[PDB]
Design a protein around this nucleic acid. Structure first.
Ligand code: NA
Ligand code: NA
Length: 327
DNA sequence: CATCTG
DNA sequence: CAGATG
């Protein structure tokens, strides 16, 4: 956690690079388990061979670990941290919609910057385009104070559309967090579930409402069960308009809400531990359900949940307010 | 995993 | 349809 800090870090750099610039998914994937194991490793890595000793650690990584230990540096790391080409890919990638794949193409067409992009807005697709248009806004954290107003709107709108809506704002927003990245809304309706064959409208009626009033600004992706878009808190008495923020809305069959809602709420840590305990208590839990564990190895069948409460109960645990869902 | 693009 | 992004 701090004993083999740098090592795990350098490695993550390397790994990252492999995958991002080169297309080295193996290599990439290599640094990963690597940092993972030295990461757990209880001692102070005093040398390569010592590390080597570990699984995932080969000769090549060992090599690298030496020079790093030997000198507060790594050539290759240094060589990569300069190199324009590499730098560009790490940068383009910042745009919503640009991935590494795309980052590569662009640079190889000489688009390596923000301007480059605008100049070539023709080569970008809708998502990507927006992504560019909102570069700044998109990187700006979302202060809970805005979050609450947003939440205030979404809910009221969903409500007017149909009393049976059940919306929820998961995320850290939910866990207490002073600021969040994007807004994530979980959605369901009674008339929607596991068997119940569809109801796309269910999702589209609200999307529309939100656009009605202007909360929703652009559409990134709109499917029948998942919507990816952009929203905005009406700028008051003109002088201060708000940044644009990412917002997602997903439909969920009523019979699977709480697990989703639990799940989405996090933290990743909370989950696991909660997930591990579930297992002890003879249970299984994932994104959508809680299933009693057979002894023959494994086994299913969906337990029935009417709240986040139903779940814990099952695993026979202390109900946890979202706030302490930390770890 | 669900949506898009081409 | 494979392949990309989130
Ligand atoms: Na990106
Ligand atoms: Na292939």
């Amino acid at each position: 956690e701090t004993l083999n800090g740098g090592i795990t870090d350098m490695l993550t750099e390397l790994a990252n690079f492999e995958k991002n610039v080169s297309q080295a998914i193996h290599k990439y994937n290599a640094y990963r388990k690597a940092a993972s194991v030295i990461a757990k490793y209880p001692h102070k890595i005093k040398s390569g061979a010592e590390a080597k000793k570990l699984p995932g650690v080969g000769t090549k990584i060992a090599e690298k670990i030496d020079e790093f230990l030997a000198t507060g540096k790594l050539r290759k790391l240094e060589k990569i941290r300069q190199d324009d080409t590499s730098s560009s890919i790490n940068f383009l990638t910042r745009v919503s919609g640009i991935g590494p794949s795309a980052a590569r193409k662009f640079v190889d067409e000489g688009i390596k910057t923000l301007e480059d992009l605008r100049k070539n807005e023709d080569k970008l697709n809708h998502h990507q385009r927006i992504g560019l248009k909102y570069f700044g806004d998109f990187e700006k954290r979302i202060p809970r104070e805005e979050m609450l107003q947003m939440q205030d709107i979404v809910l009221n709108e969903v409500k007017k559309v149909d009393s049976e809506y059940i919306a929820t704002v998961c995320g850290s927003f939910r866990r207490g967090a002073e600021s969040s990245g994007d807004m994530d809304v979980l959605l369901t309706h009674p008339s929607f579930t596991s068997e119940s064959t569809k109801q796309p409208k269910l999702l589209h009626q609200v999307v529309e409402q939100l656009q009605k009033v202007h909360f929703i600004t652009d559409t990134l992706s709109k499917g029948e069960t998942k919507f990816m878009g952009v929203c905005q808190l009406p700028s008051k008495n003109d002088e201060k308009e708000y940044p644009h923020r990412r917002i997602d809305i997903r439909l969920i069959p009523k019979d699977q809400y709480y697990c989703g809602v639990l799940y989405f709420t996090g933290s990743d840590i909370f989950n696991k531990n909660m997930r591990a305990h579930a297992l002890e208590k003879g249970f299984t839990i994932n994104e959508y359900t809680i299933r009693p564990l057979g002894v023959t190895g494994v086994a299913g069948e969906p337990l029935p949940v009417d709240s986040e409460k139903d779940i814990f109960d099952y695993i026979q645990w202390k109900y946890r307010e979202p706030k302490d869902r930390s770890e």
